[PDB]
Design a protein around this ligand. Structure first.
Ligand SMILES: Nc1nc2c(ncn2[C@@H]2O[C@H](COP(=O)(O)OP(=O)(O)OP(=O)(O)O)[C@@H](O)[C@H]2O)c(=O)[nH]1
Ligand SMILES: [Mg+2]
Lengths: 49, 430
């Protein structure tokens, strides 16, 4: 969302650190964020008779 | 000069007709041979010298029950050629008894009905009994009602149908023909009374203390209810009620005529006399939800009108003093547009006891016929059961191959939806 008031230099340093931790330790220092996607699915009009 | 004709179709109908016809013969002093060793005229007819002939006709396509009737102790009572019997059973198929084999038998039944009606001079109306969850019963009942509605017109017909229990069932296909028969009698019968077996089983278990009941015990209670309903036509009473005085008091609208009954007291001789059986306590017991003769909860809906019959030595002031108490209670609420909803009848003749039966002899009894908004639950659950199998068109081939069209199932569903919407529309306050 661009809400973190961070200098770009620190943003790149943090990403490089995260990639290093993900390769070496299989862990991310970045917290996962949820992305909600509206999907349109088909449902049959089963008549509630 | 007042008469009524009772129609019995199907195995359940014949087995409850036997139950009511021991009781009437016992109540009027007529021996099983038909010979006495002016109130009989409502149900019977005089032959000139000696025996009496019931104003009843027995119908069935399957001959076993009629053959059992024609060899029992009551072989001499019924006229030999009013026990119409077929050869082939409908086998729980509604389309069979409405389109295939019932049509060839219905003409003889209508001829018998005409021959019985020409004898009566003051015909009050017809009674009909049929277990709904069967082929021949539902189909022939529908066809007979449809023929009578046009042959006679405005004559009143009363239907004591036995709907299937909520969960207990004997067949697997009874929702289909139950729904179709409800469709047929919705626009053709003036009164329909609910009679499912599970509620009466619970009544017997709790009050009569019988742990292994059979169908005869159920049919005796139904016979007692019928006798209580029709007592006012053949016995002197301080406040009489006629059959024609019902649609003016219990039926607010032409579509709504399904109501559920109750009876009180129900007690055995082993502990009946230890308590006084006052009118107040019996009229309280009659309104108990657990004593409904159909497995429906009246606490889930409003009341529309209550017609309730007394018989014995009851005094009107005691009846009024008990109606006031019921109006007082907060757990029983009537619909807004009905300030008074009680119709009261008082008769002097106490209920008669059948030897070897369950009920004891008492001096006071009460029978209520109550129309309530809560009845929609049975329609909803039957509809839900119907939809489950009609979604996959199961068992439909047994009906399409007997002459019925494919679309005939849908319109019964639409009429039930209309009835359920109507019951909801009526019960809302203004
Ligand atoms: N209360 C009561 N119900 C009964 C009695 N006998 C049968 N039934 C009900 O009737 C339903 C089936 O219809 P039946 O009357 O047995 O048979 P039918 O009406 O002659 O129809 P067919 O099967 O074609 O012969 C069952 O689900 C039972 O619940 C009875 O003696 N008393
Ligand atoms: Mg049968």
């Amino acid at each position: 969302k661009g809400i973190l008031p961070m200098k770009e230099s620190f943003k790149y340093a943090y990403l490089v650190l995260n990639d290093l931790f993900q390769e070496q330790l299989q862990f991310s220092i970045i917290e996962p964020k949820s992305a909600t996607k509206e999907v349109v699915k088909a449902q049959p009009l089963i008549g509630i008779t | 000069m007042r008469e009524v004709i009772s129609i019995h179709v199907g195995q359940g109908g014949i087995q409850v007709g036997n139950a009511c016809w021991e009781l009437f013969c016992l109540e009027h002093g007529i021996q099983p041979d038909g010979q006495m060793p002016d109130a009989f005229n409502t149900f019977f007819s005089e032959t000139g010298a000696g025996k009496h002939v019931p104003r009843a006709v027995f119908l069935d396509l399957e001959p076993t029950v009629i053959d059992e009737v024609r060899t029992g102790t009551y072989r001499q009572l019924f006229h030999p050629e009013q026990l119409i019997s077929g050869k082939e059973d409908a086998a729980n198929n509604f389309a069979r008894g409405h389109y295939t084999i019932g049509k060839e038998i219905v003409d003889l039944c209508l001829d018998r009905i005409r021959k019985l009606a020409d004898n009566c001079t003051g015909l009050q109306g017809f009674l009909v009994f049929n277990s709904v969850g069967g082929g021949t019963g539902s189909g022939l009942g529908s066809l007979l009602l449809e023929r009578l509605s046009v042959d006679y017109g405005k004559k009143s017909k009363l239907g004591f149908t036995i709907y299937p229990s909520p969960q207990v069932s004997t067949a697997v296909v009874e929702p289909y023909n139950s729904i179709l028969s409800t469709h047929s009698l919705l626009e053709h019968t003036d009164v329909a009374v609910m009679l499912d077996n599970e509620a009466i089983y619970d009544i017997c278990r709790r009050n009569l203390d019988i742990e292994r009941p059979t169908y005869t015990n159920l049919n005796r209670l139904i016979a007692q209810v019928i006798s209580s309903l029709t007592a006012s036509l053949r016995f002197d009473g301080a406040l009489n009620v006629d059959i024609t005085e019902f649609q003016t008091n219990l039926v607010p609208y032409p579509r709504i005529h399904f109501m559920l009954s109750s009876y009180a007291p129900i007690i055995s001789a082993e502990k009946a006399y230890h308590e006084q059986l006052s009118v107040a306590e019996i009229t309280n017991s009659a309104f108990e939800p657990a004593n409904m003769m159909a497995k429906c909860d009246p606490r889930h809906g409003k009341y529309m009108a209550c017609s309730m019959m007394y018989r014995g030595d009851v005094v009107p002031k005691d009846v009024n003093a008990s109606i006031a108490t019921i109006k007082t209670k907060r757990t029983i609420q009537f619909v807004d547009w009905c300030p008074t909803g009680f119709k009261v009848g008082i008769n002097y003749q106490p209920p008669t006891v059948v030897p070897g039966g369950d009920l004891a002899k008492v001096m006071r009894a009460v029978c209520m016929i109550s129309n309530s908004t809560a009845i929609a639950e049975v329609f909803s659950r039957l509809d839900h059961k119907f939809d489950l199998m009609y979604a996959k068109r199961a068992f439909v081939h047994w009906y399409v191959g007997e002459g019925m069209e494919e679309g005939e199932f849908s319109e019964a569903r639409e009429d039930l939806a209309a009835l359920e919407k109507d019951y909801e529309e009526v019960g809302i306050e203004t």
